């Protein structure tokens, strides 16, 4: 996740990492991913196991 206190020092190689065919995330994208885990369907899934 580009831009955090835990990863900021690595923004400069994110482009090459992506050239390998991998995806880096902005903080907005990662937050959207995480909020995906609070939808009713995933919430019910978590209550299952």
């Amino acid at each position: 996740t580009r831009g955090t206190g835990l990863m900021s020092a690595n923004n400069i190689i994110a482009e090459g990492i992506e050239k390998m065919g991998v995806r880096t995330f902005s903080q907005k994208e990662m937050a959207f991913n995480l909020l995906g885990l609070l939808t009713p369907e995933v919430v019910e899934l978590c209550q299952k196991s």
Binding site: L34, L37, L38, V43, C46, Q47
Partner: protein
């Protein structure tokens, strides 16, 4: 924690470990105790 290799693990790393694991388990435990003291069994808290 930057530049702290195996032999540098000291006070700061122990405190960071407390924050990022031990007190997270304690926070889960505290929520469990509050919910059970009130007999709440059907409203679970999702921990991310």
């Amino acid at each position: 924690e930057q530049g702290i290799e195996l032999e540098h693990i000291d006070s700061k790393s122990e405190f960071a470990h407390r924050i990022m694991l031990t007190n997270i388990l304690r926070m889960m435990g505290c929520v469990k105790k509050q919910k059970s003291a009130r007999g709440i069994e059907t409203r679970p808290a999702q921990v991310i």
